[PDB]
Design a protein around this ligand. Structure first.
Ligand SMILES: [Zn+2]
Ligand SMILES: [Zn+2]
Ligand SMILES: [Zn+2]
Lengths: 49, 67, 310, 46
């Protein structure tokens, strides 16, 4: 039971273990972008704005 | 992906005992004795090594370590 | 209030008016300066269709229609289905028939349909189709060649788009996926060039050496040699009275007969489309200098001292 | 200045540094993969 920071569906978790890499994870998001020609008189361009 | 330096629960360094262990199992079918010789007394340090899965070995096999 | 284009800074004329999207505010750096009735661009904003079924999008109060191919969008459509009441009172026609809208241009749309068919039959990219469609609209709007066969005009546009993107198809190839004659596509080609007052690059041996050697399942190394054979052949000016396609074909043959593959003249003829007598003549013309044309790094199978004659 | 552009499998620079179309010389692939910056970063061992 301890100090109650674990009351009702929570948990006290050991911080030094998370320091030693406990459950650490990596997250990747890939962003994608397209250079559309888009018809008659417009154009998209990859460049320094 | 390779055994962690120091066991989570307490701190006793444990990556150093991995290569030694695969040698002991090859020599003997005594997982009890293998863990004992390495000095992994308490079981937190023991679960670490006993429950590890070395994914790195399959992972290295792709030709392109170049990208 | 008409004097703006982003200017209303009270104390000093504007130099800049940065958009702080996150705050929903318009800021003026050298003083303090908000002035904003903020819109992060109404097109991101209405886009509140999300967690609810988005595959069908019940929120779509705005269809795309793709106007930049056309010009005149008209009306919505209607169609049968409640079981009925929807009179036909006596006859067998529920409610009413739908109605055509853009007829003057319906054969422009019909041209766009033909260009994509043609385009897929030789596995072209959408980028080519998009250039082709674009050229066509330009030619159509000028109305300078309205008399000509619309299908001939679409086919010629397809040829131009293919050459401008630096991967030309032969007149023989575009004719194949069409019903228009080679002469008529060629003729329209020149006229469009005159109509748009524009020009294209001159085809080289390299632009076709790739596709041909590929379709004949020839090794990569042999393709490389043929390229070199072709390039050098043009460099030594050994074929002043010959087309680059025919020379390309003759290089492919020489390479293939210098390797284990040895594709027959009829087969090369069959991929290239040119007459096999044309290759034979072109080969007879380059044969006297064959030793000098091959890459020094080429792995020979049959030496030139044993290269056949035909 | 070059924009490198290592290519897949060939393990060599593509070298393309201009507007010309992306395709690695010699190697038949046409996927690229922009190379790491020489600019230093830093990582805390915490
Ligand atoms: Zn431990
Ligand atoms: Zn100001
Ligand atoms: Zn490559």
């Amino acid at each position: 039971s301890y100090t109650g920071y674990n009351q009702e569906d929570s948990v006290i978790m050991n911080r030094s273990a998370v320091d030693r890499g406990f459950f650490r994870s990596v997250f990747y998001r890939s962003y994608k972008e397209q250079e559309s020609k888009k018809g008659f008189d417009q154009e998209e361009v990859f460049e320094k704005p | 992906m390779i055994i962690p330096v120091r066991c989570f629960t307490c701190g006793k360094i444990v990556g150093n005992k991995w290569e030694a262990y695969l040698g002991l199992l090859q020599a003997e079918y005594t997982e009890g004795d293998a863990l004992d010789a390495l000095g992994l007394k308490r079981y937190c340090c023991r679960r670490m090594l006993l429950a590890h899965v070395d994914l790195i070995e399959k992972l290295l096999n792709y030709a392109p370590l170049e990208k | 209030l008409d004097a703006l284009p982003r200017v209303t800074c009270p104390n000093h004329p504007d130099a800049i008016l940065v958009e702080d999207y996150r705050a929903g505010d318009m800021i003026c750096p050298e003083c303090g300066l908000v002035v904003g009735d903020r819109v992060i661009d109404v097109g991101s904003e209405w886009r509140t269709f999300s967690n609810d079924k988005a595959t069908k999008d019940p929120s779509r109060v705005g269809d795309s229609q793709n106007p930049l191919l056309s010009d005149g969008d008209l009306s919505t459509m209607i169609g049968k289905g409640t079981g009925a009441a929807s009179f036909d009172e006596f006859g067998n026609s529920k409610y009413q028939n739908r109605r055509t809208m853009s007829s003057s241009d319906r054969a422009m749309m019909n041209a766009f349909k033909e260009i994509t068919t043609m385009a897929d039959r030789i596995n072209l990219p959408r980028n080519i189709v998009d250039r082709t469609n674009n050229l066509f609209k330009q030619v159509y709007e000028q109305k300078s060649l309205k008399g000509r066969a619309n299908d001939a005009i679409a086919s010629a546009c397809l040829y131009i788009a293919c050459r401008q993107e630096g991967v030309p198809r032969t007149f023989k190839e575009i004719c194949a996926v069409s019903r228009i004659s080679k002469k008529e596509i060629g003729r329209c080609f020149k006229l469009i060039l005159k109509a748009l007052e524009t020009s294209v690059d001159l085809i080289t041996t390299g632009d076709f050496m790739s596709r041909f050697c590929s379709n004949l399942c020839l090794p990569k190394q042999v393709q490389m040699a043929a390229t070199h054979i072709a390039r050098k052949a043009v460099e030594l000016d050994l074929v002043p009275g010959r087309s680059p396609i025919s020379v390309a074909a003759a290089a492919i043959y020489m390479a293939s007969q210098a390797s284990a593959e040895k594709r027959t003249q009829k087969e090369i003829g069959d991929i290239a489309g040119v007459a096999d007598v044309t290759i034979r003549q072109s080969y007879r013309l380059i044969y006297p200098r064959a030793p000098d044309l091959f890459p020094t790094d080429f792995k020979f199978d049959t030496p030139v001292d044993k290269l056949p004659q035909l | 200045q070059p924009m490198i552009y290592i290519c897949g499998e060939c393990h060599t620079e593509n070298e393309i540094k201009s507007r010309d179309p992306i395709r690695c010389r010699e190697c038949g692939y046409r996927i690229m993969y922009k190379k790491r910056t020489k600019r230093l970063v830093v990582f805390d061992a915490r």
